[PDB]
């Protein structure tokens, strides 16, 4: 009866979110959340009371994140678009994802990803470099966290550096054990924050299952991708 109105507001909040109307979407989230609290503090049942916590805390996470980004426009950002990668979704190859935001003006790429250690992660980074050379990229700056098992990482990136150097592309790799924020930056203004980073792929089914070489057909983990501009 009263909680039914809370459903309509949150629905509009989601619509505005997808339509990239973030300032309006945020306000609707706050009202949708507030209405759920007036229901949560009213419900006596214990099973339903735990259902609302999930619903509220899920919405609250989204709302709080939007506010962070809108405050983050201090020269660093401009919440342009967010694309959700659903659990076990497809069509999210590194080419398909950065297709639009890549052009001839891009000559320098910054990447902060704390998870470029294991073998598959190295290849993920490798394919990321591959599509970055066809466009006009000169220098690539990588910042990843330090493993210690680090030989595969320290030598792996070293070989990729040498191979990129064979195409006249200079790779600069730096390590830091105290990083967490995933961040992609192009010198044209575009910036991309992926939840998992370059590791949103799950291992394939069989040795010759579809989506082993072309990651457009490869299923993905559930993650979020946020797009920004700097002008």
């Amino acid at each position: 009866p009263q909680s039914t109105a809370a459903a309509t507001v949150l629905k509009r909040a989601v619509e505005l979110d997808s339509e990239s109307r973030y300032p309006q979407a945020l306000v609707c989230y706050q009202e949708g959340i507030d209405l759920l609290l007036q229901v949560l503090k009213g419900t006596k049942d214990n099973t339903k009371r735990c259902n609302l916590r999930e619903k509220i805390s899920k919405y609250m996470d989204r709302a709080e994140n939007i506010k962070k980004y809108l405050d983050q426009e201090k020269e660093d950002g401009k919440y342009h678009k967010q694309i959700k990668i659903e659990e076990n979704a497809t069509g999210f190859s590194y080419e398909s994802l950065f297709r639009e935001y890549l052009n001839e003006t891009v000559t320098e790429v910054w990447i902060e990803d704390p998870y470029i250690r294991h073998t598959h992660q190295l290849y993920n980074f490798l394919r990321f470099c591959e599509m970055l050379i066809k466009c006009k990229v000169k220098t690539i700056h990588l910042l990843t966290s330090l493993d210690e098992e680090q030989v595969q990482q320290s030598r792996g990136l070293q070989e990729i550096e040498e191979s990129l150097r064979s195409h006249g592309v200079l790779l600069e790799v730096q390590y830091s054990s105290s990083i967490h924020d995933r961040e992609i930056r192009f010198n044209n203004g575009w910036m991309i924050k992926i939840g998992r980073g370059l590791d949103y792929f799950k291992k394939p089914q069989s040795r010759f299952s579809l989506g082993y070489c072309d990651f457009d057909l490869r299923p993905c983990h559930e993650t979020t991708v946020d797009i920004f501009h700097k002008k």
Binding site: Q30, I33, L40, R49, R53, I56, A63, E64, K67
Partner: peptide, 14 residues
């Protein structure tokens, strides 16, 4: 729960 969530709503309208 009603104390954890209601406080987060204050951070939004802050």
């Amino acid at each position: 729960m009603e104390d954890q969530l209601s406080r987060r709503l204050a951070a939004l309208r802050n």
